[PDB]
Design an enzyme around this catalytic site. Structure first.
Site, PDB file in Angstrom:
ATOM      1  N   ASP A 103       0.856  -1.186   0.000  1.00  0.00           N
ATOM      2  CA  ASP A 103       0.000   0.000   0.000  1.00  0.00           C
ATOM      3  C   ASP A 103       0.893   1.238   0.000  1.00  0.00           C
ATOM      4  O   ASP A 103       1.388   1.645   1.065  1.00  0.00           O
ATOM      5  CB  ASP A 103      -0.893  -0.021   1.233  1.00  0.00           C
ATOM      6  CG  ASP A 103      -1.779   1.192   1.347  1.00  0.00           C
ATOM      7  OD1 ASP A 103      -1.865   1.935   0.348  1.00  0.00           O
ATOM      8  OD2 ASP A 103      -2.396   1.371   2.438  1.00  0.00           O
ATOM      9  N   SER A 135      -0.552  15.730 -11.977  1.00  0.00           N
ATOM     10  CA  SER A 135      -0.796  15.388 -13.369  1.00  0.00           C
ATOM     11  C   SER A 135      -1.041  16.654 -14.181  1.00  0.00           C
ATOM     12  O   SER A 135      -1.595  17.637 -13.694  1.00  0.00           O
ATOM     13  CB  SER A 135      -2.005  14.451 -13.473  1.00  0.00           C
ATOM     14  OG  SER A 135      -2.385  14.233 -14.822  1.00  0.00           O
TER      15      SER A 135
END
Ligand SMILES: CCNC(=O)C1CNC1
Ligand SMILES: CCNC(=O)C1CNC1
Length: 330
Positions: free
Chosen positions: A35, A199
């Site tokens: 994770d 992004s």
């Protein structure tokens, strides 16, 4: 040193991925969920409330000659999906794909919430975010990657998740046969303890690319892709019959649909998520309503590049003094 381990989807939907981990002497092998969104290595154990164990493999520290109680240490964690677990702490030898760390903090669960009990395939979590998020008190502990990194050939790990198929986690090296083209690296902020990056935009299907900054986290421990409501509405508007359902808890779409791809930007590069990666199947057995793999982050407080996005790429988690992320097509 290096390590290399295969990671396997837990079910036919890729709801999560499990990777075998050796703990203790003699080794006890547990299947853990790696994770990159948390920083605790915790396991079902001989100390877990018996009624809360249902098929998981447990770590038994009393059977490990290298286990030592970390005196006074406790841990307690609450995840974004509302699940939780807590317990006490041992140190022990932990190996992943041939890479061995001695003295790793192994957090033994005394309590787990219902969703952990109900998933017999996941024996615990191995956190790979930054150690500043680790919950051990009163002495915070380091992640497996942080403990390993000085020994590694290069201070990196990579995630290469499969679509409905196994993938690979590598530690200490970048397998240049595992991707196409070049790797594009992008800056990371560690201020929230996550692999947080920005992004450069998105496209829906064959549509034109929209240049817009989207700050979010690379999180192997989250199944889906969570993005701002504007972006998610633009995606689902291209699927006839798709709608946001408050009763179901997100966007659903007719299971008869063919989904468009979704592209996200990494600097000047582009990662394309094929439409089939966005199909999470019937909302309940036999339903013709299917659950979408792109959902709004509006209620979460952060955008999350989870498995839906990450499995479309070869992803480099670069733990150099100034960390960065790398993405390549594959
Ligand atoms: C420490 C809290 N971290 C989380 O809730 C992310 C979701 N994958 C782990
Ligand atoms: C056996 C490991 N398989 C992989 O690593 C594939 C390549 N993309 C996932």
């Amino acid at each position: 040193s290096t390590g290399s381990a295969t990671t396997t989807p837990i079910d036919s939907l890729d709801d999560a991925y499990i990777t075998p981990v050796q703990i203790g002497t003699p080794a006890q092998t547990l299947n853990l969920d790696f994770d990159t969104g948390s920083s605790d290595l915790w396991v079902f154990s001989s100390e877990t409330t018996a009624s809360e164990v249902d098929g998981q493999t447990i770590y038994t520290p009393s059977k490990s000659t290298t286990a030592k109680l970390l005196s006074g240490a406790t841990w307690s964690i609450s995840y974004g999906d509302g699940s939780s677990s807590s317990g006490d702490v041992y140190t022990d030898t932990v190996s992943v794909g041939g890479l061995t760390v001695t003295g790793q903090a192994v957090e033994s669960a005394k309590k787990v919430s219902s969703s952990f009990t109900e998933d017999s395939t996941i024996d615990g979590l191995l956190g790979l975010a930054f150690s500043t998020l680790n919950t051990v008190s009163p002495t915070q502990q380091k992640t497996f990657f942080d403990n390993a990194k000085a020994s590694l050939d290069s201070p990196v790990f990579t995630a290469d998740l499969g679509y409905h198929a196994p993938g690979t986690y590598n530690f200490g090296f970048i397998d240049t046969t595992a991707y196409t083209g070049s790797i594009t690296y992008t800056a990371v902020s560690t201020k929230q303890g996550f692999w947080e990056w920005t992004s450069t935009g998105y496209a829906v299907g064959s549509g034109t690319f929209k240049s817009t900054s989207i700050d979010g986290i690379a999180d192997t421990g989250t199944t889906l892709l969570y993005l701002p409501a504007t972006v998610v509405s633009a995606y689902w508007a291209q699927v006839s019959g798709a709608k946001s359902s408050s009763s179901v808890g997100g966007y659903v779409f007719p299971c008869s649909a063919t989904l468009p791809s979704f592209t996200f930007g990494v600097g000047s590069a582009r990662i394309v998520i094929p439409g089939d990666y966005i199909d999470f199947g019937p909302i309940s057995t036999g339903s013709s309503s299917c659950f979408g793999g792109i959902q709004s982050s509006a209620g979460i407080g952060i955008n999350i590049f989870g498995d839906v996005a990450l499995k479309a790429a070869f992803v480099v988690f670069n733990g150099a003094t100034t960390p960065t992320l790398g993405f390549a097509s594959k």
